[PDB]
Amino acid sequence: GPLGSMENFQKVEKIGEGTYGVVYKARNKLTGEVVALKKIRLPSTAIREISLLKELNHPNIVKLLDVIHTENKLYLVFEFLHQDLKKFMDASALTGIPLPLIKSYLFQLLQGLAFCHSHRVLHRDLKPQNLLINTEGAIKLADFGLARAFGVVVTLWYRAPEILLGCKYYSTAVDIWSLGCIFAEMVTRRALFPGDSEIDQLFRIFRTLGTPDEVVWPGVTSMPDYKPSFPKWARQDFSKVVPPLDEDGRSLLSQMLHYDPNKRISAKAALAHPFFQDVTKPVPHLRL
Ligand SMILES: CCS(=O)(=O)N1CCC(NC(=O)c2[nH]ncc2NC(=O)c2c(F)ccc(C3CCOCC3)c2F)CC1
Numbered sequence: 556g557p558l559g560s561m562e563n564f565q566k567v568e569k570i571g572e573g574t575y576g577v578v579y580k581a582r583n584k585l586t587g588e589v590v591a592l593k594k595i596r597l598p599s600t601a602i603r604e605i606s607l608l609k610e611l612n613h614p615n616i617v618k619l620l621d622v623i624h625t626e627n628k629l630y631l632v633f634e635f636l637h638q639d640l641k642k643f644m645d646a647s648a649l650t651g652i653p654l655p656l657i658k659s660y661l662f663q664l665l666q667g668l669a670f671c672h673s674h675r676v677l678h679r680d681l682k683p684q685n686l687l688i689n690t691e692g693a694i695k696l697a698d699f700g701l702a703r704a705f706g707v708v709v710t711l712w713y714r715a716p717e718i719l720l721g722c723k724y725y726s727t728a729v730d731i732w733s734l735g736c737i738f739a740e741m742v743t744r745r746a747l748f749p750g751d752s753e754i755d756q757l758f759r760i761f762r763t764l765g766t767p768d769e770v771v772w773p774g775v776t777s778m779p780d781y782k783p784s785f786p787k788w789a790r791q792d793f794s795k796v797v798p799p800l801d802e803d804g805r806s807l808l809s810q811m812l813h814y815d816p817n818k819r820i821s822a823k824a825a826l827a828h829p830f831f832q833d834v835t836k837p838v839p840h841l842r843l
Pocket residue numbers: 570571573575577578590591592593617631633634635636637638639640642643684685687697698
């Protein structure tokens with residue numbers, strides 16, 4: 556659209572770029588605020604979707620402050636946070652993130668998800684780099700994926716099996732799956748399912764959880780991309796998958812990784828799991 560609408564913002568650094576667009580750190584020249592700017596290069600559905608997201612205000616969701624259309628670009632102004640979970644896990648890789656902080660982050664993300672999901676809002680794209688942390692121990696959901704993307708990276712590792720099997724109308728359960736994969740990664744300091752193609756992702760899931768069938772996932776053999784020629788792997792023990800997670804955490808993770816989206820635990824039920832009886836909010840050691 557029109558010109559000059561972004562002149563109030565001074566870009567201070569390009570944080571990254573990719574399939575999502577470009578992310579900048581910026582300063583409002585008139586108010587002095589430090590914000591993140593997302594730039595999308597150039598849709599009625601997306602306007603409605605983005606408008607609803609601006610109304611979703613929750614401690615564990617990165618606040619979307621403004622939406623500005625200028626030239627061939629759409630800019631989204633977000634509250635700034637200084638670090639993502641990927642960098643924090645890398646920085647913690649020698650010692651591990653202490654379990655109380657893992658549990659705090661997992662709890663808070665389930666709160667954010669239960670809130671989104673109660674509004675029928677899906678994130679769709681959860682991974683460590685979509686999770687931002689601050690010095691006060693908060694963690695926040697960032698860069699929600701829309702039902703219809705728009706605009707002119709091995710983002711497979713956290714994708715739910717129903718997406719890989721061609722489900723067109725998937726559910727909030729896909730976010731619970733992704734968060735389970737992130738939970739396991741925080742505990743073990745390795746990606747749970749580090750696939751490098753859609754089929755390698757699916758087959759890594761199958762080799763660990765067992766090839767799904769109609770007993771554990773009714774309807775699976777009818778899904779658009781299921782092939783009867785899928786190899787039949789046996790399931791392994793969770794004691795092998797995420798050691799040394801205690802049995803409360805293994806139990807919760809098992810429910811987050813159910814094949815059947817009808818059986819996979821909801822964010823709301825997950826908040827009640829006994830793993831969270833002793834949840835606290837620790838302060839992370841954050842180097843900025
Ligand atoms: C070594 C890097 S860092 O750990 O030091 N760090 C320093 C700077 C930090 N802050 C922010 O980006 C930030 N603050 N408020 C909002 C916000 N971003 C976003 O809201 C955001 C976006 F609009 C589009 C795409 C992505 C991800 C980009 C990566 O791919 C997955 C999607 C986003 F996050 C994050 C990382």
